[PDB]
């Protein structure tokens, strides 16, 4: 449960190249002397697998993923491999499949088992009266919420350590498709020392377990044999592969044994067998696949801007309004760039409520309002929801759901003068508070007492619009600050304020994705020699094919060249003659991909020979290929 084995040594993740392993039967369909095509999770040839051991210096049992499909292959001489752990999170929180063999039955239980830190099995006291009897079961601790249970036939498995070389081979397939778990078994005698067999065989199904659960990881258990942490192991190994959804071809004989296997995405020699659907390929040139270059990225090629919102007459204005008679300006039908307002390095106060100004730049809005008023330094901080005083209660009140920005900077050099600036006014007394987005421009005399004022000043009759005071001999906190309040709302009107611009550089001779004002797609920008008209934007070919464009911000004509495509040709010899093939692409050079350039394309795999021989296999435009010594 908590005691882990101290005989574990860290091994680097090496690899092992397989030749033709990983071919099984995808279904129970029998054929004869044909090549059936199918799409399933198969093991690709000449791939890299894990390099693990089950010996007494290297004893490692890590956790490998399962959702991509895995293949199991392990040699055996004394039955060290006992069982596996199939769990989603390898914990008791979720369900888990347990397939183990205690040399009497195949225990198949789907419960929420309590997995230990390092579960293992083994036989104790190998000094005398061993008998190879299983006497240790430390896999799980408890069981809860079981949904499936299966007991196999009773038998007796021997774990005798025969000396010499390896004599048994057991390879399984561990995959789960739509809840149906499959076990594909194979047992055959071999003769190994260390490495994997570089041969070919098939795998037959044994059982069927419709568990209906999702499995993400797995773990392979090992056995321990020593004559509770320093127990050593025997001598075995296990390799774990990774399945991939590729297409294989199976050659069924009269008995049903798979003899050959063709990988359609390994080498261009085997690519002709999947297209022709025949094992014996005649001498010639055939088409296998279609070459295509994927685009790199999408770049919006807009150097500068075109339209602009009137921020110059609002921010850089000479005279503003008062705090009670502020003018509301509707900003719409224009593109606004909010990124230059934050990186201007000239605003002493810039705060947005609800969302960041760097986040609303990539977002379309429909109604933008802008205000402007000059107040003292003790009144800029009252422009916030929930404030009190003279500005927030009697002059300008903000609602609680304010989703705008507050812009304020220093304007002491312009809005102040020697002698006192008595231009701006503010309301001092009012009978009640103001509503959000309410303007009060009334000049009525405030009646503080019970006697009427009759429009003139007297006892308890003061003028509400008091004049401000700005002097250059004051402190830092009394300087006039130009406050700009931005309002943002959402209605049923369509959005007119947009413009998220992303331009990086001038890209040439690359398969990229262009995005213009009235044209988009995938093309290769290159030089041109035409003279486009200043009002035109793009040009087309005869059969409605756009092949040229003009940048609206840069006087340069760029042709829209299609990217590198064309058929994939290959020169294949006979099945009993040779195996060398050459790569021949169509309508491309040898730079956009034994190198030789042809008129039909780039020929990779052939040598340029000045001696002219007889045309055996044609290439194109007076070029052929043959086989010489």
């Amino acid at each position, epitope marked *: 449960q908590c005691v882990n084995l101290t005989t574990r040594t860290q091994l680097p993740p090496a690899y092992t190249n397989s030749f033709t392993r990983g071919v099984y039967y995808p279904d129970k369909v029998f054929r004869s002397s044909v090549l059936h095509s199918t799409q399933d999770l198969f093991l690709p040839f000449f791939s890299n697998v894990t390099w693990f051991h089950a010996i007494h210096k290297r004893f490692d049992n890590p956790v490998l993923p399962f959702n991509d499909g895995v293949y199991f292959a392990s040699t055996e001489k004394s039955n060290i491999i006992r069982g596996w752990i199939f769990g989603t999170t390898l914990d008791s929180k979720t369900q888990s499949l347990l397939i183990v063999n205690n040399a009497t039955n195949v225990v198949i239980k789907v419960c929420e088992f309590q997995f230990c830190n390092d579960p293992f099995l083994g036989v104790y006291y190998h000094k005398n009266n061993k008998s190879w009897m299983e006497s240790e079961f430390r896999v799980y601790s408890s069981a809860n919420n079981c949904t499936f249970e299966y007991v196999s036939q009773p038998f007796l498995m021997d774990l005798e350590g025969k000396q010499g070389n390896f004599k048994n081979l057991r390879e399984f397939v561990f995959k789960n498709i739509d809840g149906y778990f499959k076990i594909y078994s194979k047992h055959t005698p071999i003769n190994l020392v260390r490495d994997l067999p570089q041969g070919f065989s098939a795998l037959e199904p044994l059982v069927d377990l419709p568990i209906g659960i999702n499995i993400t990881r797995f773990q392979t258990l090992l056995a321990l044999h020593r004559s509770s942490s320093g127990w050593t192991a025997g001598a075995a190994a296990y390799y774990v592969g990774y399945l991939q959804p590729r297409t294989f071809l199976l050659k069924y004989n009269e008995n049903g044994t798979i003899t050959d296997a063709v990988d359609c995405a390994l080498d261009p020699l085997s690519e002709t067998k999947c297209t022709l659907k025949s094992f014996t390929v005649e001498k010639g040139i055939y088409q296998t696949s279609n070459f295509r270059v994927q685009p790199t990225e999408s770049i919006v090629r807009f150097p500068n801007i075109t339209n602009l919102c009137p921020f110059g007459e609002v921010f850089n204005a000479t005279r503003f309004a008062s705090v009670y008679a502020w003018n509301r300006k509707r900003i719409s039908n224009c593109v606004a760039d909010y990124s230059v307002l934050y990186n201007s390095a000239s605003f002493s106060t810039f705060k947005c409520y609800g*969302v960041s100004p760097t986040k609303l730049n990539d977002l379309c809005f429909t109604n933008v309002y802008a205000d402007s008023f000059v107040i003292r330094g003790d009144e800029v901080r009252q422009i916030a929801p929930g404030q009190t005083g003279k500005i927030a209660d009697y002059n300008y009140k903000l609602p609680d759901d304010f989703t705008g920005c507050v812009i304020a900077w220093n304007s002491n050099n312009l809005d102040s003068k020697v002698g006192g600036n008595y231009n701006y006014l503010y309301r001092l007394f009012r009978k009640s508070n103001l509503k959000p987005f309410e303007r009060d421009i009334s000049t009525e005399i405030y009646q503080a007492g019970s006697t009427p004022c009759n429009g003139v000043e007297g006892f308890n009759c003061y003028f509400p619009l008091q004049s401000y005071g700005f002097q250059p001999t004051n402190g830092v906190g009394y300087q006039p600050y130009r406050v700009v309040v931005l309002s943002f709302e959402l209605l049923h009107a369509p959005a007119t304020v947009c413009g998220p611009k992303k331009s990086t550089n001038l890209v040439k001779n690359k398969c990229v994705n262009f995005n213009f004002n009235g044209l988009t797609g995938t093309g290769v920008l290159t030089e041109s020699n035409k003279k486009f008209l200043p009002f035109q934007q793009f040009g087309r070919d005869i059969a409605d094919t756009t092949d040229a464009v003009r940048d609206p911000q840069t006087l340069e004509i760029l042709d829209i060249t299609p990217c590198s495509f064309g058929g994939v040709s290959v020169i294949t010899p006979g099945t009993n003659t040779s195996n060398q093939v050459a790569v021949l692409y169509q309508d491309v050079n040898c730079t956009e991909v034994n190198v030789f350039q042809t008129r039909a394309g780039c020929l990779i795999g052939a040598e340029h020979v000045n001696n002219s021989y007889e045309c055996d296999i044609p290439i194109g435009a007076g070029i052929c290929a043959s086989y010489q010594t």
Partner: antibody
Amino acid sequence: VQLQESGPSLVKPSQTLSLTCSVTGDSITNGYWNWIRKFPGNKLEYMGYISYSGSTYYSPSLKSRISITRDTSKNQHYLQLNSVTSEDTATYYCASDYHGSKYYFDYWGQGTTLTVSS
Amino acid sequence: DIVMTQSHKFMSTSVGHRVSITCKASQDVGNDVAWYQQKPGQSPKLLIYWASTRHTGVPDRFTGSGSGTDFTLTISNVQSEDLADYFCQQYNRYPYTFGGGTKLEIKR
């Protein structure tokens, strides 16, 4: 500028808090005086502010539960809270919003921890 | 209010290592992002104002840069007398909502 707080550190619920932040070294000519509530566990929260001419403005955190006065003769300023509850067990600091000789300064005192209990 | 949120709770560097304390607030931090300096056994003091200028008595190693709301207090060659709790804030408009905090210590 040297700052030192003084006053009683025991205020029962439904009573009046009274303390004094002393200023020594610089006169009250420039800079503001604010208050920041210190939660136990290295957490701070703004309380309010005052000017140095007579403009007494309040914060949205304390609309009517705060009363800050000024004193330009002794160069001090008081602090008074109304309806003191059990959530006011904290420490209040006074700092100066001074900006002189082309530099921005911010000095802090020691602080008196207030504990509200029975 | 501006909801300040810090990610790193403590930073353990050595002499010559770089101290990286991020301030990923949910709202806009502004341009006047400041940093405190809580000396052990003393009151916290101001370190950086206006995101480019240091306080009186501060060496040139305490700088700051960044872009947007992802600001980082750039500290190069931190000495043994720099163990202080650093807070990220804004000096643009009252009130001043602060963050959690990050404790700086040396490795011995």
